[PDB]
Design a binder for this molecule. Structure first.
Ligand SMILES: CN(C)CC(=O)Nc1ccc2[nH]c(=O)c3ccccc3c2c1
Ligand SMILES: CN(C)CC(=O)Nc1ccc2[nH]c(=O)c3ccccc3c2c1
Ligand SMILES: [Zn+2]
Length: 199
C-alpha cells in the first residue's frame, strides 16, 4: 500500500518542489476561467508517495525505455492536476481512463496549467463546497511527477494517437503538453496540498 512521507518546510526537497510550483505560474488564454485568478500559492503540505508496487512498475518500464533510447530515461519532473489523485497515488497512473494528442496522460511544465484540471476539464464546476473555480478557501491537490519521456516525438498539430509513434516513448505536443501512453511511465512522486491566493 501507499505511504505518504511528510516533507518538513525546512527540507531542501520541500523548498525545491515549492519553488518549481511558484516560479511556473503563468497567464492562461482563458483569463483564469479554469484554474482561478492568483499570482502565487499557499502550499499547505508536500508529501512523498512511497509504494513498492508502483516503484517496481515504474523501474521495470524505465529499463525497457532506456534500451530503446541510447541508455537514457529522459526523465523530467512535471505537474499533473486531476480530480482522481486519490486513485493515482494508490493504484498508479492508468491510461485506460484516457485529447489534443490522443489517448494519453498529460503533464505540464507549468503548475498553473495543471491547476486548471484539479476540479476537472475546464476546471469543472470548481470546488465542491462553493462551486467556485477560483476558490481561495478550499484546499487543492496536484502532483509533481517523475515522467519517463524516453525518445519523445515532437507533434505540432492535433492528432488522435493511441500510442507513441514506433521507436518513441512519448509525445511533446504543441506551450508544450507532455504526453505518455502508458501509466507506468509516470510515478506520482510529490503530492502537493495548496490554496491559490487572492492577488
Ligand atoms: C479530451 N480532453 C478534454 C481531456 C483532457 O484534456 N484531460 C486531461 C486531464 C488532466 C490533465 N492534467 C494536467 O495536468 C494537464 C497538463 C497539461 C495538459 C493537459 C492536462 C490534463 C488533461
Ligand atoms: C467515471 N469516471 C469519471 C471516473 C474516472 O475517470 N476515474 C479515474 C480514475 C483513475 C484515473 N487515473 C489516471 O491515471 C487518469 C489519467 C488521465 C485521465 C483520467 C485518469 C483517471 C480517472
Ligand atoms: Zn471552495
Amino acid at each position: 500500500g501507499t505511504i505518504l512521507l511528510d516533507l518538513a518546510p525546512e527540507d531542501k526537497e520541500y523548498q525545491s518542489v515549492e519553488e518549481e510550483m511558484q516560479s511556473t505560474i503563468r497567464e492562461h488564454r482563458d483569463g483564469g476561467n479554469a484554474g482561478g485568478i492568483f499570482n502565487r500559492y499557499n502550499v499547505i503540505r508536500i508529501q512523498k508517495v512511497v509504494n513498492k508496487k508502483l516503484r517496481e512498475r515504474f523501474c521495470h518500464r524505465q529499463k525497457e525505455v532506456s534500451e530503446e533510447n541510447h541508455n537514457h530515461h529522459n526523465e523530467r519532473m512535471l505537474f499533473h492536476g486531476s480530480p482522481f489523485i486519490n486513485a493515482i497515488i494508490h493504484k498508479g497512473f492508468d491510461e485506460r481512463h484516457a485529447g489534443m494528442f490522443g489517448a494519453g496522460i498529460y503533464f505540464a511544465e507549468n503548475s498553473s496549467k495543471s491547476n486548471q484540471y484539479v476540479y476537472g476539464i475546464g476546471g469543472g464546476t470548481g470546488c465542491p463546497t462553493h462551486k467556485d473555480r477560483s476558490c481561495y478557501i478550499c484546499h487543492r491537490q496536484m502532483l509533481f511527477c517523475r515522467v519517463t519521456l524516453g525518445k519523445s516525438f515532437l507533434q505540432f498539430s492535433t492528432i488522435k494517437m493511441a500510442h507513441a509513434p514506433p521507436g518513441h516513448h512519448s509525445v511533446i505536443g504543441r506551450y508544450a503538453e507532455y504526453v505518455i501512453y502508458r501509466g507506468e511511465q509516470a510515478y506520482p512522486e510529490y503530492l502537493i496540498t495548496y490554496q491559490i491566493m487572492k492577488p
